[PDB]
Amino acid sequence: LHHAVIPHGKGGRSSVSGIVATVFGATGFLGRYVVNHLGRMGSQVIVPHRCEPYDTMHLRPMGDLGQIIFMDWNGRDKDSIRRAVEHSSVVINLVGREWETQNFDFEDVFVKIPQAIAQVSKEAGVEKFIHISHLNADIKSSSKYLRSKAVGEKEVRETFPEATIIKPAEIFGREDRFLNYFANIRWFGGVPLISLGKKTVKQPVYIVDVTKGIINAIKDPDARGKTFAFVGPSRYLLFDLVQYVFAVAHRPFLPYPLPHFAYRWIGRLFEISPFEPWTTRDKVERIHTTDKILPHLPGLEDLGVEATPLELKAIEVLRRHRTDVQPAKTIPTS
Amino acid sequence: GVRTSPTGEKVTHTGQVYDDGDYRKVRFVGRQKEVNENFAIDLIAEQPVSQVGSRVISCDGGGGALGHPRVYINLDKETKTGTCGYCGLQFRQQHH
Amino acid sequence: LGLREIRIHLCQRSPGSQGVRDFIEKRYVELKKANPDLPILIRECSDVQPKLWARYAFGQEKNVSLNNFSADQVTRALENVLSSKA
Amino acid sequence: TRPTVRPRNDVAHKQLSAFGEYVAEILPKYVQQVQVSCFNELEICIHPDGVIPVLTFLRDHSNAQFKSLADLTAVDIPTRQNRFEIVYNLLSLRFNSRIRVKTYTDELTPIESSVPVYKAANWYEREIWDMFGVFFANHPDLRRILTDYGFEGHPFRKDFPLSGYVELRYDDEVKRVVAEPVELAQEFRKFDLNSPWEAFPAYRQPP
Amino acid sequence: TRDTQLITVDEKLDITTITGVPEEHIKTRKARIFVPARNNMQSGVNNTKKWKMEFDTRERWENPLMGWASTADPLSNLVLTFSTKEDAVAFAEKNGWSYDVEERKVPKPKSKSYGANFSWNKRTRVSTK
Amino acid sequence: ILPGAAYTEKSATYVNTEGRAQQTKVAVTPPGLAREDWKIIRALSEIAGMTLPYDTLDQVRNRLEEVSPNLVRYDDVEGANYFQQASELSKLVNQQLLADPLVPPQLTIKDFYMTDSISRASQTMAKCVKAVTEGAH
Amino acid sequence: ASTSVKPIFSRDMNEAKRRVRELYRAWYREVPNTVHLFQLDISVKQGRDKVREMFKKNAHITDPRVVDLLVIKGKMELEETIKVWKQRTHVMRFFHETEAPRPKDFLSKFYVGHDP
Numbered sequence A: 001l002h003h004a005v006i007p008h009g010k011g012g013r014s015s016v017s018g019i020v021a022t023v024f025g026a027t028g029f030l031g032r033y034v035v036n037h038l039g040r041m042g043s044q045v046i047v048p049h050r051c052e053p054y055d056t057m058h059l060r061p062m063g064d065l066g067q068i069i070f071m072d073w074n075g076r077d078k079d080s081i082r083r084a085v086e087h088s089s090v091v092i093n094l095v096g097r098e099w100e101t102q103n104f105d106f107e108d109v110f111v112k113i114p115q116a117i118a119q120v121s122k123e124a125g126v127e128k129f130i131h132i133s134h135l136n137a138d139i140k141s142s143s144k145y146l147r148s149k150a151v152g153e154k155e156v157r158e159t160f161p162e163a164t165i166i167k168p169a170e171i172f173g174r175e176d177r178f179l180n181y182f183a184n185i186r187w188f189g190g191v192p193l194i195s196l197g198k199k200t201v202k203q204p205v206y207i208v209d210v211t212k213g214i215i216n217a218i219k220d221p222d223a224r225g226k227t228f229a230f231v232g233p234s235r236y237l238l239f240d241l242v243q244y245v246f247a248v249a250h251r252p253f254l255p256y257p258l259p260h261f262a263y264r265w266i267g268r269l270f271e272i273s274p275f276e277p278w279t280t281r282d283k284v285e286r287i288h289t290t291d292k293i294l295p296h297l298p299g300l301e302d303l304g305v306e307a308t309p310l311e312l313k314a315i316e317v318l319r320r321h322r323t324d325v326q327p328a329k330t331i332p333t334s
Numbered sequence B: 001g002v003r004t005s006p007t008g009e010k011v012t013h014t015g016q017v018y019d020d021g022d023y024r025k026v027r028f029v030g031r032q033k034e035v036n037e038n039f040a041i042d043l044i045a046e047q048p049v050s051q052v053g054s055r056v057i058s059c060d061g062g063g064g065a066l067g068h069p070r071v072y073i074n075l076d077k078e079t080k081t082g083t084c085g086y087c088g089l090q091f092r093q094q095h096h
Numbered sequence C: 001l002g003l004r005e006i007r008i009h010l011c012q013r014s015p016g017s018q019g020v021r022d023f024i025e026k027r028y029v030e031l032k033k034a035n036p037d038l039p040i041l042i043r044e045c046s047d048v049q050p051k052l053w054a055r056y057a058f059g060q061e062k063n064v065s066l067n068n069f070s071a072d073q074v075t076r077a078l079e080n081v082l083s084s085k086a
Numbered sequence D: 001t002r003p004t005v006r007p008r009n010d011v012a013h014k015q016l017s018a019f020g021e022y023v024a025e026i027l028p029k030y031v032q033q034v035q036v037s038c039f040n041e042l043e044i045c046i047h048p049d050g051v052i053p054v055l056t057f058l059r060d061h062s063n064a065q066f067k068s069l070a071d072l073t074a075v076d077i078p079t080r081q082n083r084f085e086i087v088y089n090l091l092s093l094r095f096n097s098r099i100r101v102k103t104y105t106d107e108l109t110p111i112e113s114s115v116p117v118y119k120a121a122n123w124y125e126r127e128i129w130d131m132f133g134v135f136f137a138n139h140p141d142l143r144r145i146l147t148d149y150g151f152e153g154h155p156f157r158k159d160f161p162l163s164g165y166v167e168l169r170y171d172d173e174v175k176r177v178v179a180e181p182v183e184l185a186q187e188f189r190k191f192d193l194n195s196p197w198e199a200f201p202a203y204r205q206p207p
Numbered sequence E: 001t002r003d004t005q006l007i008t009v010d011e012k013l014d015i016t017t018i019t020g021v022p023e024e025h026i027k028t029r030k031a032r033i034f035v036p037a038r039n040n041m042q043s044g045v046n047n048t049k050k051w052k053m054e055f056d057t058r059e060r061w062e063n064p065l066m067g068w069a070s071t072a073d074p075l076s077n078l079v080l081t082f083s084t085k086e087d088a089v090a091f092a093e094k095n096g097w098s099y100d101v102e103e104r105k106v107p108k109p110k111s112k113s114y115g116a117n118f119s120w121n122k123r124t125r126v127s128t129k
Numbered sequence F: 001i002l003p004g005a006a007y008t009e010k011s012a013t014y015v016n017t018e019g020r021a022q023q024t025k026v027a028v029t030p031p032g033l034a035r036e037d038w039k040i041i042r043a044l045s046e047i048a049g050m051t052l053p054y055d056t057l058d059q060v061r062n063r064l065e066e067v068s069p070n071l072v073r074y075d076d077v078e079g080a081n082y083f084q085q086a087s088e089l090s091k092l093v094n095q096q097l098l099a100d101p102l103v104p105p106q107l108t109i110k111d112f113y114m115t116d117s118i119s120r121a122s123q124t125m126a127k128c129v130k131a132v133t134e135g136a137h
Numbered sequence G: 001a002s003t004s005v006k007p008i009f010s011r012d013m014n015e016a017k018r019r020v021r022e023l024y025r026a027w028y029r030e031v032p033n034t035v036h037l038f039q040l041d042i043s044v045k046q047g048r049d050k051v052r053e054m055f056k057k058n059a060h061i062t063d064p065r066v067v068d069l070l071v072i073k074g075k076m077e078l079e080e081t082i083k084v085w086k087q088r089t090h091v092m093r094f095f096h097e098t099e100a101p102r103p104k105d106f107l108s109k110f111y112v113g114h115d116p
């Protein structure tokens, strides 16, 4: 524990792995899985949080005594970010939001805050920096969510050149907003879709695969200053994918088309609430965006992670929606 | 006798202080490092040396049964004081 | 690329090593003046089956059991190693 | 008298000695040794084949009437080839006396279940099985009683580690309690306390 | 003359599969069967009577929170006592542990004589008493 | 620089001045990223494509047996013989003695305390060298 | 003699092997019921593979008495599963889903720690 930190032990709860990580946005969906893997191997995890301490309780059991440390931070306060990274050797940014708030829009969560963390991390002396982006990130799309990601990805790549950008597709899991999203369209009617789910190809990836990929990027030396594209093993049509979700959840599937402009309006209706919107204009766009194919970026297979097929671990997610299923037709590689 | 390291952390009476690059300092961020202010090595030096008129004096720490085991201290050596092994009090022999 | 060292194993007072003990007493001094730069490592140990190890270049080793041999059979094996290299 | 020393009871030492010979004469086929300790406790050491014959005699015989099974346990002595010592503690309310019966077995040899004699041995034998791994034949329901379901190993064996091999923990990824190899933040500190000087010369063993 | 019907089993006793021990701690360990050496600070010889079996020492590291000594070795504190060397080897063999046996070291009998302290010619004469 | 384990941190074999082979036992593990010395060479061989034929300590000690059978006879003295043959070969190549007196490297006790890496790094041996040179007080 | 010993259930390997198969059939037929009652996230085939693997690791045993104990313990494990004395956590402890694989090659061990 002089030059960096020497690993010690068997790689269990009470071991020392040498990883001192600050995980921004650790209180969300992808955050709880990243902290669980870091703390499960004996890492010192620092968890800045904006929420009530009551909402960080599901993280305390994830590490031995003293291994999970909680700090208050403000996305717009550079000093708070400095206090949370000055002692770390790796910084992971999972800050994000599926909707805009009166105080935080997509240009804050995905551009300004990530660049603030990257800058303070660079001058604090942090050596490794992992930033999460989107697979479909580019400034050409109707989704302001995806336009912000492309801008933020470029700014992170400039403030912290040795950063490691991860570009995952729609992540599915127990607490995801992807498979659970195609299961809450039952109290209104059928399943609205742009077109009828055709001309929309999705490549979802398992949450543990993304988590295991981020862990291996910390340990792997030849991942500094590199971009990855974490994608699932199989590609699906949004119609076939959603049909599979309802079959696994044993719900009656009544797909009917809806105009693209018509879906926007009902998105407006559901985003007037003060709480987590059920759906929004940007959410509809992203679901109906086609997952890019970037074969020039190393993916999960370049970090020793075997992508988990959606059919194998979809029952564990949709079990709670229920009151021998044919696998969905998949696009061949060709 | 609490000294402060260049980074600003207090040095404990055992000499403990985290180096500049040690990550374990992160446990004190938003909290404090508990350091006892009364250094024993400094307070027992303030006690005066006791002048006795015999070659062997006995110390029991003061208080009888509330002190420490009674030990006898030899004061024949004139180049130093006879220190009690339990409590640190010092004794000297009057003009011999 | 051939022989690099010779190792001979034997016991001190075991009958099976009698032949090898005879070889060392009389033959060995002659064998060593003819091979001044060849390390012949005689190593004795109680209750060890006698053997002859030959180590050629690049770490290859071959062993032949000298169990119950006579001094003549032993010197025969040395030639098969000194002469017929590998 | 001597205020700090336990007074002897030679009357009770005589009586238990006589009853020990009595039992040794009536069941020579199994009894291997009889002894009375300095504090008047009778031990009958028997061959394991005599568990049911010897216990039945002591329970039913008019001069024994040992109708209570106070306790039944095992002791693990690894240095013996029959490492386990099965111990029966019986009580006689008629004659207000206690007797201890000992036998032995190893990791593989079955012992006969004394449930037919004393019904109280049903759970005691399960605890012996669970904690020592001694199999009792013809037990109505033999299974673990104290250890966790699926527990591997027999904890009370002298060679089983104090902290075991696995520890439980709740994993959020799989949403359940999981078992993993044990890692202690502070290892148990093994103290070597034995004095290098003999304490009791009366128990010295021959060189 | 047992009435119980016995059977013939001609194989070395082996219980590795019915002890619950993880396979990692049966094949990778190294038992040491020895008689403990006398503590040189004391003259008592009552801890050198029995044979002990202990296992090979493994890693202990500093606990980050408190500096305590941590361990992942379940057999670190396990020590067994045996009356003789043979019944200690027997226990190791049936549990599957590789072992090393170290022969007992008993002090050599010494020739002691108080009168030699005052010898007329020999060198054993002592200068101080 | 490849960090290795000291004698208190490895089960290693040593032979004393009389041909008696003895083995140390692990008291503590080597510090930091240091590793057992013979394993550092097994690891190097595999990365070099010349993988050695032993993967465990017992296998490495089987290899020692093939080279010198007495190196696995722990706490046993194997008598060596053939002094006559050694003496015969000792006088085939004559050589001339120098004319400088035999001076041992260690004359007084000040030269005894520090002789290897471990003793030279000891703060107690240094105090012993100072004590026998400067004296008391 | 020394080699004469009481049998547990089986007097030779042939009789013991009969009890092994009778246990395998009982286990083989409860995986679908176990995977259903406990609502496990594994498939029936990989549940039956684990049963096969457990029967395979201790397949070199030649002592009839050791086989009897392995079957006695195996039946106790089956009874706990059928009676639902176990819970979802106990059934899944055969699969070690939370501990990362321990590499078995020499080099991988050499990098991580001092263990063999």
Ligand SMILES: NC(=O)C1=CN([C@@H]2O[C@H](COP(=O)(O)OP(=O)(O)OC[C@H]3O[C@@H](n4cnc5c(N)ncnc54)[C@H](OP(=O)(O)O)[C@@H]3O)[C@@H](O)[C@H]2O)C=CC1
Pocket: A024, A025, A026, A027, A028, A029, A030, A031, A049, A050, A051, A074, A075, A094, A095, A096, A097, A098, A104, A109, A132, A133, A134, A135, A168, A169, A170, A171, A172, A176, A177, A178
């Ligand atoms: N989950 C998915 O399907 C996808 C994930 N990603 C990206 O990964 C990142 C995290 O994903 P995910 O965990 O699922 O999202 P979540 O909504 O589940 O969690 C977002 C985290 O960011 C925090 N956050 C949001 N706004 C702020 C803010 N102003 N200040 C401080 N913290 C804030 C939240 O803290 P708090 O809870 O206290 O509000 C929360 O901890 C995102 O950037 C996302 O774009 C990429 C592809 C798909």
Ligand SMILES: [Zn+2]
Pocket: B059, B060, B061, B068, B084, B085, B086, B087, B088, B089
């Ligand atoms: Zn005092």
